[PDB]
């Protein structure tokens, strides 16, 4: 079926290169933009990387912090993180917004769990892609100023300089 989840994912693997482009962000550093008008609830790009445990992720983040380099991770849940720092794709440049246009959802395809960035509304060509990073207050991580610039911006987020 053309509109099934598995078919959407299969189309994603061939189309994602045409959905997005990397450019200077209107938020911070580099960001990811819609290369074309994207319909609502459409799969945009997969957050690829290496699935690791919290223990492993915290040890990696220390390693990275000692280098002059960005850290690129997506937390799936309390147990696992996708580390995109070494093996990620352009989805790792997607910035946080307190008022985002995309959502990240787990999708299972041929025996694997995947994080797919999905539009939560129509996105015009040239608009920056964002999702909400999901920083819970219960300690866990550090936190930096948020510069997403939205009206309801919580002024803080999880991350690094
Ligand atoms: N709304 C926002 N406000 C401030 N910093 C942000 C942000 N969204 C993303 N970032 C920064 O981007 C990182 C997440 S990865 C996003 C890619 C990053 N902009 C880059 O050019 O490499 C975090 O370390 C954070 O510092
Ligand atoms: Zn914000």
Which residue(s) pair with 96 in the sheet? 131
96 C-alpha to ligand 2 centroid (Å)? 7
C-alpha distance from residue 87 to each of 49, 65, 73, 80, 134 (Å): 5, 17, 11, 16, 22
Residue 146 buriedness (CB in 10 A; 0-12 / 13-18 / 19+): buried
> How far is it, in rounded angstroms, from Cα 2 to Cα 96?
31
For residue 101, the cross-strand partners are none
Mapped onto helix, strand or coil, the DSSP state of residue 7 is helix
Exposed, middle or buried by CB within 10 Å (0-12, 13-18, 19+), for 153?
Answer: middle
Residue 6 phi/psi, 5-degree rounding, is -65, -35
Farthest-apart Cα atoms in the chain, separation:
48
Contact, 92 vs 131, CB < 8 A?
Answer: no
Nearest bound ligand to the CA of residue 22? 1
Residues 147/130, Cβ–Cβ less than 8 Å: no
Q: Is the CB of 146 under 6 A from ligand 1?
A: yes
Which method resolved this structure? Answer: X-ray
Q: Residue 107: which domain range?
A: 1-161
In whole angstroms, how far apart are CA 32 and each of 1, 16, 97, 110? 30, 12, 13, 27
E strands of 39-155, at which residues? 43-46, 50-53, 73-75, 80-83, 95-96, 102-109, 112-119, 130-131, 144-145
CATH of the domain at 92: 2.170.270.10
* Closest ligand to residue 27's CA: 1
- Helix or strand or coil: residue 24? strand
Residue 2, exposed/middle/buried by CB under 10 A (0-12, 13-18, 19+)? exposed
- Asked if 142 and 158 count as a contact pair (C-beta separation under 8 A), the reply is yes
Distance, in Å, from the CA atom of 130 to the CA atom of 30, rounded to the nearest integer, reads: 12
Closest Cα to atom 9 of ligand 1: 95
Q: Domain tally for the chain?
A: 1
| Residue 102 CB neighbours (<10 A) | 25
> Resolution of the deposited coordinates, in angstroms?
2.2
Q: Is 132 in contact with 156 (CB distance < 8 Å)?
A: no
């Amino acid at each position: 079926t053309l509109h099934s989840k598995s078919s959407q994912y299969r189309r994603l693997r061939t189309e994602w290169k045409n959905n997005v482009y990397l450019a200077r962000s209107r938020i911070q550093g580099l960001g990811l933009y819609a290369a074309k008008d994207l319909e609502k609830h459409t799969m945009v790009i997969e957050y690829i990387g290496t699935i690791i445990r919290n223990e492993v992720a915290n040890r990696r983040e220390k390693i990275y912090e000692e280098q002059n380099r960005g850290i690129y991770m997506f937390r799936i849940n309390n147990e696992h993180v996708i580390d995109a720092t070494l093996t990620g794709g352009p989805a790792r440049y997607i910035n946080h917004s307190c008022a985002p246009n995309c959502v990240a959802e787990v999708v299972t395809f041929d025996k694997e769990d995947k994080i797919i960035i999905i539009s939560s509304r129509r996105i015009p060509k040239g608009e920056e892609l964002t999702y909400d990073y999901q920083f819970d207050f219960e300690d866990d991580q550090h936190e930096i100023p948020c510069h997403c610039g939205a009206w309801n911006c919580r002024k803080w987020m999880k991350g690094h300089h």
